[PDB]
Amino acid sequence: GSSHHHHHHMSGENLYFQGASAAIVTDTGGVDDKSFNQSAWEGLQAWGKEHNLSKDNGFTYFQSTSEADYANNLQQAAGSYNLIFGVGFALNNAVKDAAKEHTDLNYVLIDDVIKDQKNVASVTFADNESGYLAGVAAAKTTKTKQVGFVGGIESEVISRFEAGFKAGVASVDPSIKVQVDYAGSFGDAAKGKTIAAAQYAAGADIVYQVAGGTGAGVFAEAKSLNESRPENEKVWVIGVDRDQEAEGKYTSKDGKESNFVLVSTLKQVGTTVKDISNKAERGEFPGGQVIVYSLKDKGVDLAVTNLSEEGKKAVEDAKAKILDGSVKVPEK
Ligand SMILES: Nc1ncnc2c1ncn2[C@@H]1O[C@H](CO)[C@@H](O)[C@H]1O
Ligand code: NI
Numbered sequence: 026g027s028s029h030h031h032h033h034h035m036s037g038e039n040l041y042f043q044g045a046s047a048a049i050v051t052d053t054g055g056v057d058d059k060s061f062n063q064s065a066w067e068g069l070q071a072w073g074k075e076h077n078l079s080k081d082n083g084f085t086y087f088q089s090t091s092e093a094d095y096a097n098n099l100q101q102a103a104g105s106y107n108l109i110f111g112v113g114f115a116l117n118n119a120v121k122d123a124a125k126e127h128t129d130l131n132y133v134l135i136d137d138v139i140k141d142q143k144n145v146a147s148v149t150f151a152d153n154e155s156g157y158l159a160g161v162a163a164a165k166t167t168k169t170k171q172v173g174f175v176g177g178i179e180s181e182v183i184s185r186f187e188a189g190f191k192a193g194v195a196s197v198d199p200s201i202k203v204q205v206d207y208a209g210s211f212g213d214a215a216k217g218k219t220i221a222a223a224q225y226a227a228g229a230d231i232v233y234q235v236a237g238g239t240g241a242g243v244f245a246e247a248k249s250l251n252e253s254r255p256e257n258e259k260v261w262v263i264g265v266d267r268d269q270e271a272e273g274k275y276t277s278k279d280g281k282e283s284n285f286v287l288v289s290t291l292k293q294v295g296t297t298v299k300d301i302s303n304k305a306e307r308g309e310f311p312g313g314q315v316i317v318y319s320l321k322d323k324g325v326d327l328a329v330t331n332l333s334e335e336g337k338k339a340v341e342d343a344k345a346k347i348l349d350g351s352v353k354v355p356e357k
């Protein structure tokens with residue numbers, strides 16, 4: 026206001042900001058998946074730090090034992106939390122039902138859309154765009170002209186990554202074969218190891234793992250092979266969701282210390298959890314809206330860790346073309 030004029034002096038002790046309590050309900054994969062759920066949890070604990078809270082005293086996570094536990098975890102969360110995040114497309118139905126029972130609480134679904142509910146916000150990522158960049162990187166590195174893709178669960182969500190990745194490989198050299206296999210789970214490391222073993226054995230020298238915690242198996246396999254080979258004969262893993270450079274550390278047969286993580290796609294789930302938690306606490310929750318994070322707003326990106334300069338150039342060129350609209354990346 027230009028002028029106020031009628032005013033009273035208020036003491037700082039008598040202004041107060043009402044806090045929110047925010048919880049994430051995570052899928053089979055856990056808060057220690059080194060990727061999707063860990064990004065969400067790192068974001069919530071950053072938000073907790075900023076608001077002077079601790080685990081189970083203003084923020085927490087509920088690990089879901091199975092699909093049946095989604096509803097039970099959301100109901101438990103409604104006991105003490107007024108902003109509740111369902112982390113993963115699979116929580117769609119359970120979040121819709123919980124939001125109808127508790128119209129006074131706010132709900133966020135990550136990686137899928139719920140429509141026509143004033144107390145639900147939906148968050149999606151253009152993982153096709155980051156996958157494309159990963160494809161360009163892979164195409165510019167593969168010596169065997171074969172690369173692997175290990176998906177978690179067949180879905181709109183993982184199909185975005187797969188379509189982007191194939192389009193990205195094809196944009197550089199369509200002669201490169203892309204072996205695709207799904208694990209049927211985001212929390213099955215042993216299946217990730219088996220699938221990686223076969224993709225590498227069949228002559229893939231790079232595997233992109235888009236399977237959350239299942240990906241720990243892909244890392245374990247690549248490490249095993251690379252530990253029993255010369256440095257210059259190593260096989261690569263592409264990281265997902267977080268920068269997974271740290272998981273790529275090994276000692277070759279040769280005795281050289283090295284890293285088998287080529288690049289990582291980034292998905293800023295943690296940043297989204299923190300920003301929406303702050304909006305919820307300020308009484309500006311984006312209920313009923315669909316928030317789309319893409320390459321332009323850096324909600325997805327590629328970390329170019331151990332890529333060659335030729336690869337880094339091809340990634341920067343592809344990135345610019347996606348941002349300007351010259352390349353439209355397929356979603357299926
Ligand atoms: N536990 C999970 N539940 C649902 N989707 C998941 C889970 N872990 C990973 N994903 C999906 O797989 C992608 C690659 O890890 C993530 O960006 C996310 O879309
Ligand atoms: Ni004023």
Ligand code: NI
Pocket residue numbers: 031032033
């Ligand atoms: Ni007055």
